[PDB]
Design a protein around this nucleic acid. Structure first.
Ligand code: APC
Ligand code: MG
Lengths: 202, 990, 200
DNA sequence: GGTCGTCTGGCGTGCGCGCCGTTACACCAT
RNA sequence: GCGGCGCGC
DNA sequence: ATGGTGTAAACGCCAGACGACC
């Protein structure tokens, strides 16, 4: 019942219980970000992508496909790719360029990154509601979701494991967000941890 | 670069904040750094040298000289000035002073020039002069023995020492004005003023005072926590200096913690229920810290006492019981008797400005913790922050905001809180303002004010004003001072009636808004079941309509409440209003909420503080002004207007006695409230033993026909068109926009015969008003798109039909009758073409347009493309509208300057002049003399010669320069018409 | 002067000089259609889709991927894929759902048809201006295009080069041109003819 | 390297002040 | 700065 | 009294860029 709202595709529970690696994707209007996990709460890859040529008044599918192909080149292989879904709708007269930008990014990453769909028909990319992730960590107040930088600051500085290979990189990312905070980079870990705690590891 | 700008800003600020001994441990440590020693000797060594020269020191400037010598840069004869300045306040043994004087004489340096080049303070300059004269007393120079006096032809009579002159004085004694000045000083040292609101409160309760008490204890707890957090963060930031660089904490240590906690608790009360932009909050915090620092540094330096003494001396020229050895202009009297010096502060660049606002924003949210939920149970008793960060969408961009807590908003809404807040510069001054003596010196006591209003940037106007010799601007500065020295007071009966209507449901047809309790309601509710498919769509369409009306109502009531509360505050007081100008010369007041360039209600609450007896001919002008403000008749002579007022005497009496009880005759006029004020004044004047001895305070208004057109007919003389705008004498006034209408509508009386929908739906809608703006702008740049957009709005308020295609109208005047418009107005279009082609050819060569007004003010246009290239279209479409709007201002300033010499009270709106009822004829003669004085000189020849000298000097290429030369040298031939006929026209500014 | 406004992506002229087949795709709200040609103006395939579960309510990527893959699996292999480009404006407050649908389907088609893009960076899918083809056929009234059934009625039912085996099937398919307004989706063949007439 | 004639697109008469809100609205059955 | 409004010459 | 919460798809014109020019 709850998984009907948490995850949009309807997937049978047996293949969820044996998942190994998951990558979480959060879009923005000026950046994208993603993180990697390996069933031991061990972070190995967590990166961002700035300096786009999009959302500058031109909506052409050629530059979209070049930019997406460059981003998807560095993303490794995994059992599932979980995706962030927002509450914007078509009813807002304004905020439509943001919605148009989001739906194009989602569709192309859905058409790509699911390589063997034409043969066996197994889905491998799925959505997750952002309000449910905030309610799990009690980051919700006034029908809205707060930042969450203090939670991940506590983690980096038993909930999630952490190797020493990328610890200095993320603490540098924490220092960079101290000057100018960005939430696309912070929402990735919260979504991944919420997935291992709701859908898996009951 | 950025770091050099940051250090220059830091040192220039901290020398002003008396924190140079604290900040001396930054440049030393930075110069100790090897790779970072670049961009360090550029412009900050003289800054710390001047700061050391501000106060006394003992062998403290040796280190500065040693570091300069190690850097191997030129001291540029500024370090020696600091050494001479710090040589005082200490015993001098004259050791190797001859060597110092030889070093001054050698190395190509000479005296008598560093006194103005270094530009120290008056005290430092006096100390340096004393130290020089203690050894060599032969060298001494005077700045200037005679003051400079203007010599221009149009300003020769004003500054002439011959002739007998009369200058008005104020009505108040000296001690009263001294106490008023003290009151304003104490009001402005506090940066904000609290005003009681206007809304009617009822029924306080126990939970109300409980909310008030928990607010009080919450605010005390927040104040203690904020003080502790400020102390802890200052202690943390002090530690990083000796193993680091760029201390940001001295800028924080500038302000005392009480000031910081006051502004931070008073900025939280005005934060909206929804969030605010984080960058906007940082900008506001930095700007307010700068504004507080200016006043604090002005009050701690002893400048307040000197200003008070000079003001008390200068106030004898205005006092009613004091005399002067010789009368003079206020600016010349302040120039004599000594004068203070402008601060000339330079704002710091962005990296040091926004970072500290960010720091204070991070300080505020973290260290303020409300005791959990504020509901009736107190079981939790936890500490949670009041404010949280929320990632949101605003405009068309993702923006992070700073949002409050719902319990805080619920607590704030529970109380009444009839207190309102205001900035000090938004209210009128309670003392006479400072005279305009310079583009730097202003009008307010402590806050600096800019002379030229700029939307954003635009430093070219300031540079042009500072480049010209100072004697050229005197005729504009005097006019600004004269407009600033007018005393006002508040009418009481009108305010009482307005508040009475405001408290009880309002009256939207008189201009006062209505409360949200009487917002319109939908006729039918919503049904869940789909009874009719068409019902749901109309339900959505008519339930999405009331919200916009409610929001508009809320905005209107907010602005009216602000205005009325400020008007209520200034009861039983006298106040003043200063003035500024834009880049084309037109003048505006500084306080925005409450001045005379406003609506009817803002103009009906204002009266002259000083009164004049009506004299032989004072009541007739009052009745003429009353008929003018009614607006019933604008086409008849003055005799027929004054005849009308005698017929409505019973209506005047009934409106003056019982306004809201009997016959409401003053309703239905174009200006109801001003009409009522005039009716009360006239009735009081009539019910007297001697009407000619009655003291009146009501201003009288005289306006010009069409001032933009009126200048065209004399820049080049036209015997046709001059009669159109009454430049030439006649008995009944002549109307351009009324005569245009008759030809424009002649066709529709005789074309609805062919048959058109737009032609027969109108049926008499056309009038003067509907085509007034478009007919006005045809002489200026205009297109058919702008004409349609103009005509559509005028057709909107008229309610007869919603079939709004306005194309019949825009084409009918600018096109079908445009030849009739050329036939109606012709030969004015040759300059309109000539100037546009000249602007086009200047812009194609990559240059902006600049010129000089006949008085002497230089004028430039800022339109540039997105350093940057000139925008050709924007600088050829704006030159004709921006050229006439300097000459009209010149006319206004000349009329004011010659009106002041005869002892008159003069205040001016653009094109309309206001004065007492007894002083109308003098102003009417002065205006018609000064128009001929202004327009008898050749204007177009001087403009052409200045344009040729400024642009056609360079022989870069033969073709473009030659074409520019034969376009600028070609001037339209002026017609045969003489300008000695303005002096007898009755309706020129009437 | 034309090729900069005919084709949205940029490609070399020599590659356009040497072609062997094109697949022309035109989509709409209810269905799609496509046609195949073989460098001598000879038709080989001409099909259309029946119906969708799309554009009835919410927008979801799963149903889009299902329908797009199911349709594309029946396509033959060709050299260049050309798809239409409609010039709707972002400024107009209306026409948002159709614009969102068009952009989503364009992105999906570019993603799934441009095979072997990661290895070889050459574009294989192109966008053609609709008004340009309208001016070439001269059916434009200056603001909108008329019906294109006249050309396909005149050509079918010497240069058409229709193969003899496919006459009866094409005629049977065209005999049902009296409902659903499917004949407007017959502009794919017209666009293919225009491409062969402006690429050589 | 320098043109570059022409062909397609983006504002449209000039200047100066104030207020408000970032879709909630509506339904819900406890 | 974007959007909706309102006022003055 | 309260959160919960769902279900809502209107047109010219002139001046800088672009394929052809040299
Ligand atoms: N809408 C507008 N567009 C351009 N300039 C305008 C303008 N309104 C006013 N101006 C400028 O300001 C000057 C003043 O115009 P007005 O003095 O109002 C003529 P008026 O006959 O007094 O109008 P009125 O009869 O309604 O009072 C004009 O000559 C023009 O220079
Ligand atoms: Mg006028």
């Amino acid at each position: 019942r709850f998984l009907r709202k948490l995850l949009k595709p309807d997937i049978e529970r047996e293949r969820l219980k044996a998942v190994n690696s998951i990558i979480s994707i959060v879009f923005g209007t000026r950046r994208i970000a993603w993180a990697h996990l390996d069933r031991k709460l061990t972070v190995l890859d967590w990166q961002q992508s700035d300096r786009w040529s999009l959302m500058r008044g031109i909506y052409s599918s050629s530059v979209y496909l070049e930019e997406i192909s460059s981003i998807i080149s560095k993303m490794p292989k995994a059992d599932f790719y979980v995706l962030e879904k927002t509450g914007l709708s078509i009813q807002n007269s304004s905020l439509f360029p943001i919605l148009l930008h989001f739906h194009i990014m989602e569709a192309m990453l859905y058409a790509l990154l699911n390589k063997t769909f034409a043969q066996d028909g197994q889905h491998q990319v799925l959505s997750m509601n952002r309000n449910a992730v905030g309610k799990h960590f009690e980051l919700m107040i006034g029908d809205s979701r707060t930042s969450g930088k203090e939670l991940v600051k506590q983690f980096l500085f038993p909930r999630v494991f952490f190797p020493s290979d990328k610890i200095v990189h993320y603490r540098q990312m924490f220092l960079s967000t101290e000057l100018q905070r960005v939430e696309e980079l912070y929402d990735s870990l919260l979504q991944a941890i919420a997935f291992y705690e709701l859908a898996v590891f009951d | 670069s950025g770091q050099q700008q940051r250090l220059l800003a830091f040192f220039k600020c901290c020398l002003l904040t008396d924190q140079l001994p604290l900040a001396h441990h930054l440049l030393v440590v930075h110069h100790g750094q090897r790779q970072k020693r670049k961009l360090l000797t550029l412009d900050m060594y003289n800054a710390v040298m001047l700061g050391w020269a501000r106060q006394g020191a003992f062998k403290e400037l040796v280190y500065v000289l040693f570091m300069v010598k190690d850097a191997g840069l030129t001291p540029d004869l500024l370090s020696y000035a600091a050494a001479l300045q710090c040589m005082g306040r200490q015993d001098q043994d004259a050791g190797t002073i001859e060597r110092c004087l030889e070093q001054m004489s050698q190395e190509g340096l000479k005296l008598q020039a560093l006194f103005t080049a270094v530009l120290l303070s008056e005290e430092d300059r006096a100390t340096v002069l004393k130290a020089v004269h203690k050894v060599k007393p032969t060298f001494s120079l005077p700045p200037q023995l005679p003051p400079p006096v203007n010599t221009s032809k149009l300003l020769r009579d004003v500054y002439a020492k011959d002739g007998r002159v009369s200058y008005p004085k104020l009505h108040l004694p000296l001690k009263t004005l001294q106490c008023l000045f003290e009151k304003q000083l104490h009001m402005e040292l506090a940066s904000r003023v609290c005003v009681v609101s206007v809304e009617k409160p009822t029924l306080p309760s126990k939970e109300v005072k409980h909310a008030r008490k928990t607010l009080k204890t919450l605010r005390d707890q927040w104040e203690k926590a904020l003080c502790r957090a400020l102390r802890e963060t200052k202690n943390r930031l002090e530690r990083e200096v000796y193993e680091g660089r760029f201390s940001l904490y001295p800028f924080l240590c500038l302000l005392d913690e009480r000031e910081v906690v006051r502004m931070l608790l008073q900025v939280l009360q005005a934060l909206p229920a929804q969030g605010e932009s984080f960058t906007t909050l940082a900008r506001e915090l930095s700007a307010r810290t700068f504004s507080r620092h200016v006043v604090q540094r002005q009050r701690v330096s002893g400048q307040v006492q000197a200003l008070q003494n000079h003001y008390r001396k200068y106030l004898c020229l205005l006092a009613s019981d004091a005399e002067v050895p010789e009368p003079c202009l206020p600016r010349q009297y302040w120039e004599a008797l000594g004068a203070p010096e402008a601060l000339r502060e330079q704002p710091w660049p962005l990296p040091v400005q926004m970072e500290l606002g960010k720091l204070l924003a991070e300080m505020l949210v973290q260290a303020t913790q409300m005791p959990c939920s504020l509901d009736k149970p107190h079981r939790s008793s936890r500490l949670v922050p009041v404010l949280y960060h929320v990632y949101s969408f605003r405009n068309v961009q993702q923006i992070g905001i700073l949002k409050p807590h719902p319990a805080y908003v619920q607590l704030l809404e529970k109380a009444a809180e009839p207190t309102l807040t205001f900035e000090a510069v938004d209210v009128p001054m309670l003392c006479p303002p400072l005279p305009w003596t310079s583009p730097h010196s202003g009008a307010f006591l402590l806050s600096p004010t800019k002379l030229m209003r700029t939307v954003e940037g635009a430093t070219q106007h300031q540079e042009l004003l500072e480049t010209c010799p100072p004697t050229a601007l005197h005729g504009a500065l005097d006019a600004l001072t004269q407009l600033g020295n007018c005393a006002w007071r508040v009418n009481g009966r009108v305010l009482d009636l307005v508040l009475q209507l405001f408290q009880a449901k309002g009256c939207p047809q008189l201009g006062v808004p209505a409360p949200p309790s009487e917002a319109p309601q939908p006729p039918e509710a919503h049904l869940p079941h789909s009874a009719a498919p068409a019902r749901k769509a109309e339900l959505r369409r008519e339930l999405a309509h009331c919200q916009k009306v409610a929001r508009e109502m809320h905005s209107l009531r907010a602005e009216a409440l602000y205005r009325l509360s400020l008007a209520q505050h200034l009861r039983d007081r006298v106040f003043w209003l200063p003035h500024n100008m834009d880049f084309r010369g037109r003048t505006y007041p500084c306080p925005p909420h409450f001045n005379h360039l406003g609506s009817d209600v803002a103009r009906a609450l204002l009266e002259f503080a000083q009164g004049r007896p009506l004299g032989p001919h004072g009541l007739d002008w009052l009745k003429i002004h009353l008929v003018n403000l009614t607006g019933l008749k604008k086409r008849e002579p003055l005799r027929k207007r004054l005849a009308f007022a005698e017929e409505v005497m019973d209506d005047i009496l009934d409106s003056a006695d019982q306004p809201l009880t009997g016959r409401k005759w003053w309703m239905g006029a174009e200006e109801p409230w001003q009409t009522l004020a005039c009716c009360m004044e006239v009735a009081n004047a009539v019910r007297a033993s001697d009407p000619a001895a009655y003291v009146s305070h009501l201003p009288v208004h005289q306006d010009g026909s069409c001032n933009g057109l009126q200048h065209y007919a004399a820049l080049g003389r036209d015997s046709v068109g001059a009669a159109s705008v009454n430049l030439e004498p006649s008995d009944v006034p002549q109307d351009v926009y009324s005569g245009v209408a008759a030809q424009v509508e002649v066709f529709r009386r005789q074309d609805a015969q062919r048959g058109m929908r737009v032609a027969q739906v109108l049926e008499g809608f056309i009038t003067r008003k509907v085509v007034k703006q478009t007919v006005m702008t045809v002489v200026y740049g205009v297109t058919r798109y702008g004409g349609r957009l103009q005509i559509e709005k005028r057709l909107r308020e008229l309610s007869d039909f919603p079939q709004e295609f306005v194309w019949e109208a825009s084409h009918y005047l600018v096109r079908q009758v445009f030849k009739s418009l050329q036939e109606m107005f012709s030969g004015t279009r040759a300059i309109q073409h000539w100037l546009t082609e000249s602007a086009r050819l200047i812009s194609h060569m990559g240059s902006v347009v600049e010129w000089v007004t006949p008085l002497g003010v230089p004028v430039i246009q800022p339109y540039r493309l997105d350093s940057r290239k000139p925008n050709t279209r924007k600088q050829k479409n704006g030159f004709p509208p921006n050229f006439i709007h300097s000459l009209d201002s010149s006319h206004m300033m000349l009329t004011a300057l010659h009106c002041y010499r005869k002892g008159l009270t003069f205040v001016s709106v653009h094109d309309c002049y206001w004065t007492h009822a007894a002083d109308v004829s003098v102003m009417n003669q002065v205006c018609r003399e000064q128009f001929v004085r202004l327009h008898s000189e050749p204007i177009l020849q001087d403009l052409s010669r200045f344009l040729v000298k400024r642009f056609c000097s360079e022989p870069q290429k033969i073709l473009e320069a030659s074409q520019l030369k034969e376009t600028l040298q070609a001037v339209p031939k002026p017609g045969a018409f003489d300008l000695e006929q303005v002096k007898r026209s009755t309706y020129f500014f009437s």
